[model samples]
Target: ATFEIVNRCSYTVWAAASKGDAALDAGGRQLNSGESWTINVEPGTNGGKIWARTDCYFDDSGSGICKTGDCGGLLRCKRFGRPPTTLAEFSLNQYGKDYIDISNIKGFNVPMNFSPTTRGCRGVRCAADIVGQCPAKLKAPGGGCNDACTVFQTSEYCCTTGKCGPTEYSRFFKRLCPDAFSYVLDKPTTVTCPGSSNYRVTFCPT
Candidate 1:
């Protein structure tokens, strides 16, 4: 039901998914680059409609989810009810305006650190660096900053512990596929932050 990807780079790699081909979209809208989402599919229930969807949309056109380098990797699900149903991976251009920005959030801890004014502007980028990871909520929208601040019970958006936290998958992606990323934003990342957008990612050419 799950697979692992490896990073071939020296620095951290961020994996984003904002858009998908019509085949994958399947009534679901496209997303921006570097956009991560989590969803639960209820089989045959209500005609197998999307149980839920989370995260921000760039526009009504469903295009702002890609990260950097025009790389929108695909997570495909094919339930054909036919012989040899396929659930596999596919590739898509990562370039698009469908990407969402959720880096400007305070730490997701108790006592509710919802004070954006007191928090910095780098968003979750800073938090991801601190724990050596990053996470984008696929199952819920508010996970980035909104969920991290309010509703601290750890639903679809927030992670109280660092393990199953949202950033865990991103960290794992960075570890497995180091060369498959690009810096969305940041500058001289090594001096201060490692995963800053300006860090510059160079994906391993196919």
Candidate 2:
């Protein structure tokens, strides 16, 4: 399947994608404002993740810091990116279909729109402007909104224990992007697409 990454923001961003055990793609490549990049994954690829890095400064060796969504400070991120990022996660060909979502459980840095190009498949999006309206306590130092889990680090915020439910903080995110995951225990956020469907992820969609 193909994953098309589009940049609609005002500035350039580095886009990254990790497909299962396969090599990471576009680890440090720049997606200039109004540009797009497409990555192709083999059929049956599962548990692949995609996200964008903003306000980064990498040396010639591909090591540096990102204001948001830094993955182990590496250009080729074999691991998941740090929190306060809008994630587009997928497990393709799982249980006979594709499971996908725009996750904000780790908090949100940018708006994202995830859509299936295939016929009969619905699109899911989390395009809320979170940076300007982020709560004072959950604000990240660098910019963007930090998750309650990252800020408070409590069982209630992290949902590490039994029968976790939404809190006032989670409700803030839910009120903005009701279709996306607001916490670890969030349900009804995953969208199912038919097998081998092509998907598009647009950053800062207007």
Candidate 3:
């Protein structure tokens, strides 16, 4: 499988990708506007995700922080990124199918578009102007809306235990981008695409 990370925003963005315990593409790579980077993945790859870091500052040694989507303050991330950012998640060729989705469950920093290059699979994206329309309670200090789980940290909001559904907080995100994953139990957010198809992930998609 393949991922084409395209930057359409006016400003530069640091694109990152991780699979299992490894960073598939080394972190801290800067993608200027209109630039793109492609990463090839092995079949049946799981725990894969791609996201963009904004307002980042890294020194010569690649030790710094990003205003959004910071991954443990490391140039080479050993874990998933912090919240208040958009994410493209995938489980490729697992159990006879490919599962993919764009999630705001951790929150959203930049608008994103994720779609297969082939015609068989349908697209999924969260291209809403969430930064401008973010609710005051869910708004992050740096920017973007915070997920209910991050802001409340309760079982009710995080859905850690029993069955749960969308709350007013999740509804806020669902209203803007109905197709994106808004909460932990968001079933519609998960989509199945062919593993043989290459996918494109575009930031600030217009």
Task: Count clashing residue pairs per candidate.
Answer: 48, 0, 0
Judge candidate 3 against the unseen true structure and give its global Cα lDDT, from 0 to 1: 0.85
Worst 10 residues of 2 by lDDT: 19-28
Select the stronger candidate by TM-score from 1 and 2: 2
**Candidate that scores best on TM-score:** 3
Please identify which of the two predictions, 2 or 3, would achieve the higher TM-score against the true structure.
3
Q: Residue 100 deviation, candidate 2, in Å?
A: 0.8
Instruction: Put down candidate 3 lDDT per residue, 1-206, tens digits, no spaces.
Output: 87788999999988888863788756447899999988787787887888888888888887889888888876666578888989899888887778888899899999999999876788888888888898899988887788989998999789889678889989989999999988988866788876667899999999
Rank by TM-score (best first): 3, 2, 1
Q: Give per-residue lDDT, candidate 2, residue 27.
A: 46
**Given candidate 2, what's the lDDT at residue 42?**
70
Output the number of the lDDT-best candidate: 3
**Ranking by lDDT, best first?**
3, 2, 1
Q: Which stretches of candidate 1 lie over 4 Å from their true place?
A: 1-14, 19-129, 132-147, 153-206
Cα lDDT, model 3, residue 143: 72
In model 3, which regions exceed 4 Å deviation?
Answer: none
What candidate 2 gets wrong by more than 4 Å, as runs, is 19-23
